[PDB]
Subunit: 387 residues, 4 copies
Amino acid sequence: SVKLAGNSSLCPVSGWAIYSKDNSVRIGSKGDVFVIREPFISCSPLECRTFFLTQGALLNDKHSNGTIKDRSPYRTLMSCPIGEVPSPYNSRFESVAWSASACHDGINWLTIGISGPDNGAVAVLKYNGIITDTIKSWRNNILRTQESECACVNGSCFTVMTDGPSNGQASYKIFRIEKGKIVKSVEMNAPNYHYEECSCYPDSSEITCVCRDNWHGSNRPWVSFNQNLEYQIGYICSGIFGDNPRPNDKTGSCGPVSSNGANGVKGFSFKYGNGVWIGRTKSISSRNGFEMIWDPNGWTGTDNNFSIKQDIVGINEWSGYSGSFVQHPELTGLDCIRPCFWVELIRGRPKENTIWTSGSSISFCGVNSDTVGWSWPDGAELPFTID
Amino acid sequence: SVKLAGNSSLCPVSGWAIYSKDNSVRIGSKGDVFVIREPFISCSPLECRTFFLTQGALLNDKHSNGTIKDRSPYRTLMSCPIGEVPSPYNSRFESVAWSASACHDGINWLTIGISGPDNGAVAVLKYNGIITDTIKSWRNNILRTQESECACVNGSCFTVMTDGPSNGQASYKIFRIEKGKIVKSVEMNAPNYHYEECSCYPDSSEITCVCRDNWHGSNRPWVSFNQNLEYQIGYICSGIFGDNPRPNDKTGSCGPVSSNGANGVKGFSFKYGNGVWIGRTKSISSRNGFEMIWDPNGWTGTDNNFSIKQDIVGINEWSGYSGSFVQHPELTGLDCIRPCFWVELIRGRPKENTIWTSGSSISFCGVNSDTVGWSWPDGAELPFTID
Amino acid sequence: SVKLAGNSSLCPVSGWAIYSKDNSVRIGSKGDVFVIREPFISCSPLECRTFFLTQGALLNDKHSNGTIKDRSPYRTLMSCPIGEVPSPYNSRFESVAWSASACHDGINWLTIGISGPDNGAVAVLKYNGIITDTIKSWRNNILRTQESECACVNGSCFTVMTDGPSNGQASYKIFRIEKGKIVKSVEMNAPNYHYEECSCYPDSSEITCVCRDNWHGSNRPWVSFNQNLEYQIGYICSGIFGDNPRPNDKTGSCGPVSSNGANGVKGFSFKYGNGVWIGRTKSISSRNGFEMIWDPNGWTGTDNNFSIKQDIVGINEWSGYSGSFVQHPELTGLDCIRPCFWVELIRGRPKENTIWTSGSSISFCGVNSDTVGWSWPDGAELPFTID
Amino acid sequence: SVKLAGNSSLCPVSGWAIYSKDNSVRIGSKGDVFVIREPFISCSPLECRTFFLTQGALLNDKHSNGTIKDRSPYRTLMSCPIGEVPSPYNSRFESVAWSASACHDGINWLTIGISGPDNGAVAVLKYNGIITDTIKSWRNNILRTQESECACVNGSCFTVMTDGPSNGQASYKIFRIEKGKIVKSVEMNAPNYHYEECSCYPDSSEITCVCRDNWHGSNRPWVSFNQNLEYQIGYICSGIFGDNPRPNDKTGSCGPVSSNGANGVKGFSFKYGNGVWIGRTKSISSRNGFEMIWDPNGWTGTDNNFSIKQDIVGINEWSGYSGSFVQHPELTGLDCIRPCFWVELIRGRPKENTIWTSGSSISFCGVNSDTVGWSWPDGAELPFTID
Ligand SMILES: CCC(CC)O[C@@H]1C=C(P(=O)(O)OCCCCCCN=[N+]=N)C[C@H](N)[C@H]1NC(C)=O
Ligand SMILES: CCC(CC)O[C@@H]1C=C(P(=O)(O)OCCCCCCN=[N+]=N)C[C@H](N)[C@H]1NC(C)=O
Ligand SMILES: CCC(CC)O[C@@H]1C=C(P(=O)(O)OCCCCCCN=[N+]=N)C[C@H](N)[C@H]1NC(C)=O
Ligand SMILES: CCC(CC)O[C@@H]1C=C(P(=O)(O)OCCCCCCN=[N+]=N)C[C@H](N)[C@H]1NC(C)=O
Ligand SMILES: *[C@@H]1O[C@H](CO)[C@@H](O)[C@H](O)[C@H]1NC(C)=O
Ligand SMILES: *[C@@H]1O[C@H](CO)[C@@H](O)[C@H](O)[C@H]1NC(C)=O
Ligand SMILES: *[C@@H]1O[C@H](CO)[C@@H](O)[C@H](O)[C@H]1NC(C)=O
Ligand SMILES: *[C@@H]1O[C@H](CO)[C@@H](O)[C@H](O)[C@H]1NC(C)=O
Ligand SMILES: *[C@@H]1O[C@H](CO)[C@@H](O)[C@H](O)[C@H]1NC(C)=O
Ligand SMILES: *[C@@H]1O[C@H](CO)[C@@H](O)[C@H](O)[C@H]1NC(C)=O
Ligand SMILES: *[C@@H]1O[C@H](CO)[C@@H](O)[C@H](O)[C@H]1NC(C)=O
Ligand SMILES: *[C@@H]1O[C@H](CO)[C@@H](O)[C@H](O)[C@H]1NC(C)=O
Ligand SMILES: *[C@@H]1O[C@H](CO)[C@@H](O)[C@H](O)[C@H]1NC(C)=O
Ligand SMILES: *[C@@H]1O[C@H](CO)[C@@H](O)[C@H](O)[C@H]1NC(C)=O
Ligand SMILES: *[C@@H]1O[C@H](CO)[C@@H](O)[C@H](O)[C@H]1NC(C)=O
Ligand SMILES: *[C@@H]1O[C@H](CO)[C@@H](O)[C@H](O)[C@H]1NC(C)=O
Ligand SMILES: [Ca+2]
Ligand SMILES: [Ca+2]
Ligand SMILES: [Ca+2]
Ligand SMILES: [Ca+2]
């Protein structure tokens, strides 16, 4: 076992090849499948796993009732092999959690699970499944984290947490973690910015996080930092607006775009110099569709001009959260960090007539070979028997 | 593989971080989950497992009928990874048993499973799943043991067994076990004491057991011993009374507290010099709630004064048995033996209107970092379909 | 990996300690559990497994209909860890089979699965799951084998097969198998003997098989042989008659006891010089109860006098087949081959009002420490929903 | 780990011994079993696995509705151990796919999964579960592949893909793949030939593929090639016609036999000089029965004369696709490549009155020891509850 280096740059990619699909909701009609949301993928140097927040309940059972609710003492962070349905028969228990992150440093898994009251939640950090640290809410207002993988470089792993309002100014901290122990943290000085649910990836020994402004931004905020937590902040400048909801595409801003800026969805993007690969919903107003868009000047430039779109989920189909995950050279044998992404396909409440909310997932990896657009949606027929 | 040393002292702890939650009863509404009681956790130098006594039946099936009953030829000791629901698809078979213990010496698992008639029960000891010894009832009155992990030091493991009445004087024996073979035993000379269901942990090469006085004590008895089975006995002196039922807190005794002393619940406590960490129910009269209390003078002093309470399960929620488990330095990389605990959350009979009784579990580990009180209860909605 | 020696003698045993119980039928009321019969246990130098003949169907499903029937193209030999219920989620596939045997030589598993028409059945031999030999019926009348483990000594494994009538003289062959290849066979010259379903175990470099005379013997036939297949034959002489059905105990014979001799049940016994440990049903007329009896002169002497009985299953409870299995020194660390046994607890047809027949299992290992009699029966409540 | 050589010739075989049977459809009546079709087997140097295209749904659940349909975004390539039922609790996720292939080079698994639109489908190649290449449709008309294992020789693996009409001339390409990367491809110049769903096996360092002519041939086309993709083409000359549908046996042709040539079924055959082992349906008009036929002159000669038939599935029972798989010397310890085959037993639509279509499987391996004909059919009773 050797620590992941994380010093190479992101692989160049022309399109996105399909990597996995679990069909969780379709299978959970009959099989014993957890009610989940906030899924994400992360890889060790030997496998990729799907992590997820269960609701302590199965699909099509009465305890799925009320699962629109975000935070309870029943929620647990669990994981299973990528592409398999999350069941009690194939899932590893990770942590008690209603917000989470996880990543592998090359030697062992770090998991981060936040539970406890809204006014005093505690993140429990584990390394190889042993508790190695805790951090308690410093603003007493829903201490919360990425809902996607943390990022590792040279034996350290990194994450972002938020505490305070989700509809106004809050407080955002970056953490350096070594063998599950917090060895440094910094509070970002980011007045008028809003960071939620960051998608963070390593690139050339530094971390780049693309997050969600749930306050007053329909473009996405970003924070980038090196191993010592020296950080910079901005918003993606492209007029191909990344959040949901958002306005129609038009001239962008390098600061938060107020139009349709309140609310949001977890997302990601990958920076390539001045260019950006953006994943987003197809609808400007709800969690429908998914597409990947290459804007060669979109990280730093404000026009609404792009060079490539690839369809992922059709406009009339349900999408949800999305996030980055990477495959490092130690896993792939490549000379670059391979970028991949996942999409959560949310079914049930609030859009559909059910007692429950749950999701399935799809994922893709970036390649420089031929790809195609299509739609790979959830495919379950709702409502279910229990509804 | 190397034997666990067990020579370091208990880690200092300021609070209890949440470690696991299985949601067994909620999941067993639909999934194939064993009817269980008497769960406990124990760790090897590589993983922690949940051990439990099944009823040879699944939740929501007719064979769960009558599972208030303690002893039958259908009960088996099985185990699964911590935090996973106990199913026939993820559980390792250990022993035929209606009372049990288990622990790992650093090389292999010892399990102890008692079965047979009330007038002549036999404990079957296994090391790495091979039968290595038996011990038969010496009082012909329900030979029985810890219902939690045994404790290992320097290649030997240790347990306590009781035979005789549960409402009067009985007989209590301590055993030293090496590779599943009993190499020494002693009968404790403890007139007017009652020991049931001991929670035993290693600390500085000696074993400390905190047990249940089911006869006439609402504080908890203790027995401590070294590897040669030279032992001392007492009761926890604190007026923060540890058993359930019990009286309201008041001046304690270093002997059995007669008030509300009959009956009891399995529990634990950790000794730190003159101080004690006590886990107990919140109700004085039934198995409701759970809390951890630090009394800095409570091992040896009789006042009802404490310095720290942390809530675990709310007063209006069902609790049940609780027990110690430790994580040794060989597992954690620490310089001390880490104390942890589990709580059984009992659902069904006798408190609820069901044909069945079963439990889920929560667990916590001691840390010297920030923690919080909350309630993490079972969460199943009873009755079930089968009722 | 090293070949099992099989050169030590059988461990001396005073009684039988309980080793496993699966509760298959009770669990299969709800869980996904195979309809099985003809279970047996066998151990490698690392684990013990339960082998069984499935009916290609689950309990409580319509395809369990008609499972009184012995031979079909749907039956498969599968295995799972000892004490676990045989499900499609925990069972390894071994062979297509309606009669079987299996054993581990110290390096790999041999399995033997017989399938095909009654007039031309073929045994398929596999070593480490690769087909290594076949043997075809030589009498065109239900080629069939042990339904329990084969026996290994010094890199060779041994079994017995029968072809011809089950109610008259048939033909019986002994086979020596090396890495799944038949290297020698002999036809036993045994006029007026009947051998079915042999329970064969190694002892002092030789194999002893105790079988079932389904023709005209209520005591059990035996055949013993060395590695070169030089063999001797006899019947257990004790008047503690071993088969079911049988007469009440009285003076025995060293030849087949005609009284109630037609029909039978698979069984076993262990030879200790002139003495014998006999396992048998408690009823003389049906598959009810189980008990172990030590007769110190019963291998070679004809009196109905015994020195020890231990109860296993009560007289009013269903039993079924039973068989030997051993644990060699390479597994246990002992200086002798440890004798163990299993009992099949048959439920459904023909004794009960169901569409189906299936079994659960119990097992025990011989020890020289304290033991007790009891009853550990199946415990399912019939009929089931599907009936 | 060492690359498979693939330089020895095919083992000589006199008959086919039964290797596995899963009973998937029978078990899926109650258990949680995927709706599948297009199953196939492939082996590593350590195990054999069943690969299959799921429909993202379970048997006896409403999402099995409409599963006669071939191509959807819900279909996934998954695998499980040979002989086990394909469930979400025992199946490894491989790829998103509605057409597939897989094989092991001695070091790692290659999988090939085709998904996307009919007018632009993309094959995603993975080596050890990491995406290593893609190939996009070059004729924009259902890019598609073997539905059975690819073939490996000396660190390279080989497959055939088709793009264009299934009822007229299409385009056929052969690919050489090294560690999941396409290192060479060639378009076969095969005017008036039709290649679908090739069964390809290694033999003496070359690959032989026997396929399906869905255009105008009731005998089977073949293509053989060496590692550099120098290829030859023909049709099996025997008058024992291999496809379904077909005419009654009569004088054959070395070119496509037009009589009943439209449509087809995936199949295989093994070449032994001028002779051929043919597997085929028993019915000339539908997917009923299965039999193996040795024609000692049938590869190159046109008579309808044969030397050996062995029955596999009875004339009145449902069959389906069939395919080759091999076991190399590195797995078996033999000096030749062992030929084996599988049969898909298709149940449901279009032949039966159900909402769904799914299959079970049987397999056999070639031996030079005694064998027998029989019928090992699916055995499920249709319709099911959901119908
Ligand atoms: C902004 C970050 C964060 C601030 C607490 O909130 C996150 C947002 C979401 P999100 O998917 O946007 O929520 C959908 C709400 C649907 C409301 C429907 C109303 N109908 N009814 N009843 C889910 C997350 N688990 C949640 N995180 C935590 C930790 O709770
Ligand atoms: C005191 C130790 C021991 C002495 C035999 O009894 C233990 C106590 C308990 P406990 O949880 O306190 O029992 C709850 C009784 C509820 C009675 C309800 C009445 N309604 N009805 N019908 C469970 C344990 N398995 C049991 N051990 C064994 C070996 O049987
Ligand atoms: C004697 C050896 C052998 C000779 C073929 O027969 C064995 C005997 C039995 P056994 O348990 O004794 O059978 C119970 C019969 C119950 C009949 C009930 C009648 N009611 N109805 N319908 C099971 C075995 N699988 C069977 N072996 C094979 C290979 O078929
Ligand atoms: C010829 C190769 C290929 C050309 C696209 O078609 C293959 C043929 C079959 P096949 O088993 O022959 O199809 C059975 C059709 C039954 C029709 C019943 C009509 N009733 N209704 N509604 C299955 C395969 N998945 C399919 N491959 C792909 C990639 O779709
Ligand atoms: C990353 O570090 C490795 C190991 O020293 C080195 O070979 C490589 O050049 C670095 N890569 C980049 C892209 O900087
Ligand atoms: C869901 O919860 C509501 C409100 O507590 C209740 O009225 C309803 O019956 C529940 N439904 C189910 C299926 O449990
Ligand atoms: C990586 O960490 C090592 C060891 O802590 C440190 O000495 C070094 O500066 C770091 N290397 C890089 C390339 O950032
Ligand atoms: C326990 O033993 C180890 C190994 O000899 C030693 O380093 C350590 O000091 C001991 N610890 C204590 C706390 O006594
Ligand atoms: C439970 O057992 C009782 C008493 O034997 C019986 O009357 C009742 O019907 C049973 N219930 C179920 C669901 O089996
Ligand atoms: C531990 O056991 C060893 C070996 O049996 C013994 O010699 C020694 O006294 C013990 N050590 C301690 C530290 O108790
Ligand atoms: C069996 O063989 C071993 C190894 O040579 C030897 O030590 C032993 O004496 C033999 N045992 C008996 C009981 O013959
Ligand atoms: C069992 O089979 C019989 C006879 O074929 C049939 O009449 C009966 O309905 C079947 N029962 C079930 C539950 O399938
Ligand atoms: C065991 O097998 C070996 C090797 O085939 C042989 O030489 C020897 O005679 C046998 N030994 C015993 C103790 O039977
Ligand atoms: C295949 O290669 C091996 C290894 O060099 C060699 O021993 C063998 O003769 C070859 N086999 C054939 C049948 O050509
Ligand atoms: C199957 O689909 C058809 C057509 O969409 C529908 O009318 C029918 O009810 C469905 N059946 C089930 C069991 O879902
Ligand atoms: C096998 O591959 C090697 C290495 O690429 C090559 O040098 C050789 O020609 C090939 N050998 C055979 C026997 O085809
Ligand atoms: Ca926003
Ligand atoms: Ca008490
Ligand atoms: Ca008889
Ligand atoms: Ca054709």
